[PDB]
Design a protein around this ligand. Structure first.
Ligand SMILES: [Cl-]
Ligand code: NA
Ligand code: NA
Length: 97
């Protein structure tokens, strides 16, 4: 029946340990989501399980929306996107709980 779609937020500040990824996130920040998709929080007993699904669903949605427009993500984009989305999913879980 579809998923819950969180409110847009400022893309998070993340100090990536890989220096090149750290720079790449800043250079290309607008490529990544600023909103997450999820199943309702009360369907989970813990944060980690929620976040796991929230990351998978959000990355799936974002990649599908992008590919159908004839655009592409790099391998670096995917690594950064997963981290960005994980942080926003954690935020969403803590906020919505
Ligand atoms: Cl932003
Ligand atoms: Na480093
Ligand atoms: Na594509």
């Amino acid at each position: 029946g579809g998923y819950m779609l969180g409110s847009a937020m400022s893309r998070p500040l993340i100090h990536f340990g890989n220096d090149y990824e750290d720079r790449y996130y800043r250079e290309n920040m607008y490529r990544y989501p600023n909103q997450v998709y999820y199943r309702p929080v009360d369907q989970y007993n813990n944060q980690n399980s929620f976040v796991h699904d929230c990351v998978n669903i959000t990355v799936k949605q974002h990649t599908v929306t992008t590919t159908t427009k004839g655009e592409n993500f790099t391998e670096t984009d995917i690594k950064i996107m997963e981290r960005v989305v994980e942080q926003m999913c954690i935020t969403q879980y803590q906020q919505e709980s």
